[PDB]
């Protein structure tokens, strides 16, 4: 057996957009994401799936059945988002220069929550207090992310700008939204410091500004592909993340961190290991270095420094890299650049979603997590596309035998949230990508146990890996699968 | 849900040969089966794969833990059978006209017995007492066998007559083993009435006489390719089960059935109805209405009539027929003849041995039995060659469903044993084809729990297929399998 | 055996964007298509796949062995075109009111084309001579296409257009690329009537618009997301086309018609037949009504500067499009058609080409039957060829699709030839060099060219005019069980 | 360009129970094999896939429309087998000690020839002629074998021996087979010299005695599983060729050699070189250092009466075989070689034919130059060929072989010819029509011959005496992603 140790918790994470929606009363359709989905020129480009929210898995009515459901699968740590537009779904007064690159402070206190306080649906509040006081009562240690993508419409209207008009709410292009964000997340903690046991600021601002401006072809908002659009993003980004840590912990004395989209970087040939390391600084410590050394571009900005109490670690698969004159390139027919249900160049089998299955790959992110920057890690998402349930078991097993791996090797990790509970809209992607341990039945919103539920429940129950499922820390047999 | 009757068990089947041996001393070198696989040059031809039996997964040793995962899994009913040879090793004295062709009665009684118990080995006597012991103390109900295909060496040397030598011990091309089989069940039913609960004379006896003289390609031994010597080996068997019944029952008052491989007889176009009834006739009437009724070739046996009280039904696919000129004829790409780990010429996803995925024969089998003989059945035996796990949850639940079906519909049908527990040794296939819920590792002989045993303690446990399971009942999907 | 008309040619169709550069001098790097595939934001994206044309199968300097090649192989018919970058890479003096919508007329003389002259590149000029020359040479009749997707940088900057700015040069957004192309037509015909036996305006114009404003997904410049300009863009790319016709009128008596890209579309369930025609009305009809009926929409009028534009229709098909009656309308559905996986097998069990199109050769007879039916204008099938670097399928499908023609004109349809695409592997736009289509193949390191077995097979059928009894048994779909599902 | 000596021929190898029938009158049931196929008990036990041979491809009645297709072609050597029972389908009278196990030496003399030809089928001999007529016509070199695996009933019924039934006639396991022999390939050398260019005693012995006597499930006569039988039979082929090749030259002063079945044999790893060269011993030098050198085992002896009976080596080859070194000896893998999945892929990654076997060309470079490194004696690649009716893999199979067979005389081995298995499609013994080898497709319903693509590329071949620079790329291995896995 594969035994954890005594507080670590294994549980599950999910976000407010992809599975809130589906129960009648649901519906928030002031986002950009949902304009973005909605939008016809976006659908006929094929840009996005043209599968809707709003026939989503209902966690928005039936959370009590998920709660159910996890408990009974054992489980003891959940990670969820507010949505900030079912929160703020009306434009607030303006503020403070719009033209001024840096956003150093946003001065936060009682008075001026007090009135935020006037804005905010109240409807919104108390549903959230419903859901949260439920989870709490299975047991459920509590993570609260403030965002996971989705603006308000007021703060962002993406068809304008892929239409390249920047006249109106641009999103992460504006500073507008980092001053917005740090106060919408001092409200949240303010509101909800009860039942809360730790933070995240965001989920994945890295695919927020990579995919949103760089990625064009993901069909994520608003699509307008510039390279110094993208660095803007990012920049505004980083910032509003020291800003809403400096405005939750304006009212919370409790952790706050941060969740990010890792790949494990692995050289194509021996030659290739100076190309791993510039790609690991291109994707991964130039924006750590920023939030925890506040090293940015090369000054340092002590607004920026040490905002930043843990790491949330994202996970799927490795991305293959050779050096290149100029630098470095990634290689198609590795990592996520596979054909789906299928093999990669490496003989190893691909997911629904073409994601080539190399669990080692996060032995190597949490260690290289760990040795840079000495934060607790919590594996924030990890799972796999998986309708039919045939890699999942393996999947699950032999990523929870490389977080032991790393605690063994000295790793401070304290939970494995897998991705996810059930399935859910996978964003431009639509339902067709079924990441849940539950299928859901989108017609009758039905949660099924699939096998690597009854897997799981054996690891969380136990807390460890049994030695009756230790096969499972293996790679999914490929004769019988697609080639 | 789908919900079984208060008395209705779930458990597993499986085999003496196939796995008892692999733990040092388990070793039972006297057997036909084990000469047929040891032999040279039937190693040479390919007819057997070169695995051995002596290298199985050793449950002479290690039946308490078979029988504590057994448990665990929620299992109330177990059917396995003694091996012959182990308490019969050496050659008994000769009694009887060997010339005659039928074998009208076989007279036991209590001298007889106390007789043949002084050749009897005592150790392994002992030893199957151990093992029936534990097994009743974990509430299994004991479905005892008493043949499943190896015969004694001293009975049949299965190679002289592979080489068209019929001077020596012929097998069941004797009546010598007719009259011996009688006894030894007349004698295992004295020894074990106390721990037996129903019994059964013999597993399947329509494929050792069609494999051993007809399929010859299959390995089985003799592998003597006549039909008449076919012929004339089932018709010793059907008389050897008629003489064991009335062994059985001079000493016990238990019932006494027979397990029978089946296939679910499908028409390939709505003109082939005749060509069902034609195949259904052939390979499965003309032996019950022998067997139950007498009837036999067109004459009635008293002595056949009336000699069975259950029916074991064996079931894995469909074999498709078509109407033809003379008669009919199974068509290849369907059922059990088709490409390995691929697809059927229906688009139906097939096994590791090849066999298509056909859960509506099974409701199509029992019903049929059902109202041609209004006798109780078991299941005894179904499941799937899937080392890997992919299909064998959907499998699992597909037919199980059909069972529910089946008594539904008003069929006495009171267990489903699953074939098998664990990875065992498939004849001359060896030991690559492997059908546990459990997974054999063969170098060390641990036991490990696929996700599909974990579904089937959900339904033993609940006694139904449960709401969160019942997805299950379902074709695995094709399209991330291999073509 | 399945003969053909003693008038009938076999050939080729080849562009110049795809196929010239690739020697020492060829370079062209004057165009908005050029710009696009280098332009590092696209790359980084993936809208382009990073290989360059400037690699290519080098017909610009190669051109007499691939005549040599398509000699050899029997072939009597080549569709080529002029790069209009070429010949005027740098702009032309501005002429003509720019705000206003409809272009009508392009007024060209001898003067005005004399003065056109004195900006042409000589070399370029005197180059394409030499190719045409040399291709006629060899017996070959010649159809002369005047377009063929890239326009000269300075009549369209597509990063600026890509990026959402309307103010440079806007391609088929403006009327000063209508009136230019016009005027490149009517040079073009001035400069080779001698040489040319049929001429074409434009290759596949639906495709420009289409893949350029709403196919973003498919890395086609400006790859700007807009129902409203897609539609402007094609209402000029048809004036164009009109005005090109009588500008080449103007100067020569020989057929003018077009090249347009074609799907059969078929229904799903018997129920589906309306959603047949309304996908063939708004994919095909609207276009072709306009320049031959003069009908259009700008409500629903008769332009006579648009009506009569037209000799000829160039039917160019690889596959189907398979439709089905919506509540609003009608949609088309993947896993059939240009919408399957590669190297698979569609929905319906048919065979899928490296480009993931579904083997369909029965559409070809649905299409060219149904133009005739229309217009009654003859027709030349000329673009017709599979992805197919092995060679697999090739020939199952290069036999096939010439018995639909045959089946074609057996029903009364008249057409005049058959142009497989192509001669040779070439550049294959933003999917780059992977997808090959050459009856030979192209070693793009030494730039030599091998036959394919399907070469060998079309020299049987090119040299005989026929489908020969030996090769019939070709006129069938490849065996799936082989090959990838 | 990879150019062949002016004497080498490229043609193609048939043999006569394979091919023969199909037309009306050219029924041949009285061999072995015939009513092995028809047996109702090995039909059901799948031992015989239950196709039969009368329905096949018809070269009895259409050996005219073959040979045309042949010459077009550009082929100019042919091997083909006339079959004894069709000759003497009757029994001949017995002459000799049946018990001897030795058959040193078969007195053949002109009045002993004179008697035989009393009792031999007047028609068939005379239809043999117009056969070979025909073929010489045609400018074709012919090698005639003498046999081809079918033995007349009299001399084997393989039922009676499959059953264990060893009193009736016992085929190879009688030395009555090797008198008669003998006698027949004396004959037919007597009455067809004047036709025939070289001559064969047999073809793969090794698959007769193998197949028929320990690899069972193949469903070769008789199906006898006996390590000892098998020895018996193999020691009795080995004489019958001795007193064939002294038969014929008794007669004649043409060459004569035997062909054999051949596999590449190829180390698992760099520790298994020591199992290639015991599986060559096995497989491979055992039998010709047998008939080369009269080298034996009955001990290890020097037999005077089968030292040097062989002119040439006729190489049968598709693939190899991957040996591994062993505590006992050594062991074939599963998995590469003729051992694989079909259509699929070798656990090397190779692309597998039809039948399951690995494409591996370099193989035939290792048989050719060993055989002649070991004997040096001239050979002829007698049989080279792949299932394969869709034609994906042939054409890369085909060039990629010849290319081997340039790159064995490169390297000073004398070889000259290459033989294709095979001109078109036959009866592949227990497996009936599926497998089909021919460079023409079949159609068994009305006997029509098509030209796969790989015969086109078979003509460029033949008739320029070369691989040609323009299909030089199919000296490749056929692209595995577009095929089944
Ligand atoms: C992490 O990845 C999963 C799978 O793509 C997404 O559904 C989540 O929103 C993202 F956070
Ligand atoms: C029923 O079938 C299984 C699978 O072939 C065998 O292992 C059993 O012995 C037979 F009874
Ligand atoms: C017709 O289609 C082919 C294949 O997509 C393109 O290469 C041509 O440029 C287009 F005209
Ligand atoms: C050589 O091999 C081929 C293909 O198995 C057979 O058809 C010939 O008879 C044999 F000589």
């Known amino acids: 057996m594969y035994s954890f140790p005594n507080s670590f918790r294994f549980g599950w994470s999910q976000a407010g957009f992809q599975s809130?929606?589906?129960?009648?009363?649901?519906?928030?359709?002031?986002?950009?994401?949902?304009?973005?989905?909605?939008?016809?020129?976006?659908?006929?480009?094929?840009?996005?799936?043209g599968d809707l929210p709003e026939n989503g898995p209902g966690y928005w009515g039936n959370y009590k059945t998920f709660h159910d459901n996890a408990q009974k699968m054992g489980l003891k740590i959940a990670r969820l988002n507010v949505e900030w537009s079912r929160i703020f779904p009306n434009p607030l007064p303006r503020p403070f220069d719009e033209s001024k690159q840096d956003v150093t402070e946003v001065e936060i206190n009682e008075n001026?929550?007090?009135?935020?306080?006037?804005?905010?649906?109240?409807?919104?509040?108390?549903?959230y207090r419903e859901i949260f006081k439920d989870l709490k009562s299975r047991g459920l240690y509590f993570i609260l992310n403030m965002y996971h993508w989705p603006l308000p419409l007021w703060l962002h209207d993406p068809?304008?700008?892929?239409?390249?008009?920047?006249?109106?709410?641009?999103?992460?292009?504006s500073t507008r939204t980092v001053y917005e964000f740090a106060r919408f997340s001092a409200y949240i903690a303010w509101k909800f410091?009860?039942?809360?046991?730790?933070?995240?600021?965001?989920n994945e601002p890295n695919v927020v500004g990579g995919?949103?401006?760089?990625?064009?072809?993901?069909?994520?908002?608003?699509?307008?592909?510039?390279?110094?659009?993208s660095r803007r993003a990012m920049?505004?980004?980083?910032?509003?993340?020291?800003?809403?840590?400096?405005?939750?912990?304006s009212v919370s004395?409790?952790?706050?961190?941060?969740?990010?989209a890792n790949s494990?970087?692995?050289?194509?040939?021996?030659?290739?290991?100076?190309?791993?390391?510039?790609?690991?600084?291109?994707?991964?410590?130039?924006?750590?270095?920023?939030?925890?050394?506040?090293?940015?571009?090369?000054?340092?900005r002590d607004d920026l420094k040490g905002r930043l109490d843990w790491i949330g670690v994202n996970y799927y698969t490795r991305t293959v890299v050779k050096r290149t004159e100029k630098g470095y390139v990634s290689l198609g027919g590795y990592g996520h650049g596979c054909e789906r249900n299928s093999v990669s160049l490496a003989g190893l089998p691909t997911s629904d979603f073409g994601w080539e299955f190399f669990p080692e790959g996060l032995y190597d992110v949490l260690t290289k997590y760990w040795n840079r920057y000495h934060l607790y890690m919590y594996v924030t998402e990890n799972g796999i596309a998986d309708d039919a349930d045939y890699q999942r078991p393996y999947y699950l097993v032999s990523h929870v035998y490389q977080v032991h791996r790393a605690i063994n090797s000295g790793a401070d990790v304290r939970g494995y949230l897998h991705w996810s509970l059930a399935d859910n809209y996978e964003w431009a992607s639509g339902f067709s990508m079924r990441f849940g341990l539950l299928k859901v039945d989108y017609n009758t919103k039905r949660l099924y146990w699939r096998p690597s539920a009854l897997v799981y429940r054996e690891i969380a129950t136990n807390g460890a890996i049994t030695d009756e499922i230790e096969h499972l820390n293996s790679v999914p047999p490929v004769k019988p699968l697609r080639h």
Chains 1, 2 share one sequence.
């Not at 410091?193 to 965001?202: F, G, K, Q, R």
């Not at 401006?213 to 110094?228: A, D, I, R």
């Not at 920049?235 to 912990?249: L, M, S, T, V």
Request: glycine letters at 8%; a negative charge.
């Open 20 to 49: 809130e929606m589906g129960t009648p009363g649901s519906e928030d359709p002031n986002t950009d994401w949902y304009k973005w989905v909605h939008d016809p020129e976006n659908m006929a480009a094929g840009l996005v799936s």
């Open 112 to 127: 001026e929550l007090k009135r935020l306080d006037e804005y905010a649906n109240k409807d919104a509040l108390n549903h």
């Open 264 to 300: 494990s970087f692995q050289p194509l040939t021996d030659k290739d290991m100076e190309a791993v390391e510039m790609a690991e600084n291109d994707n991964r410590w130039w924006f750590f270095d920023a939030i925890i050394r506040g090293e940015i571009t090369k000054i340092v």
């Open 253 to 260: 004395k409790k952790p706050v961190g941060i969740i990010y």
């Open 235 to 249: 920049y505004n980004i980083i910032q509003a993340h020291a800003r809403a840590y400096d405005g939750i912990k």
């Open 211 to 229: 995919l949103g401006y760089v990625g064009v072809k993901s069909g994520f908002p608003p699509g307008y592909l510039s390279f110094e659009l």
């Open 159 to 173: 068809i304008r700008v892929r239409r390249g008009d920047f006249t109106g709410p641009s999103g992460w292009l």
């Open 193 to 202: 410091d009860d039942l809360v046991d730790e933070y995240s600021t965001m």
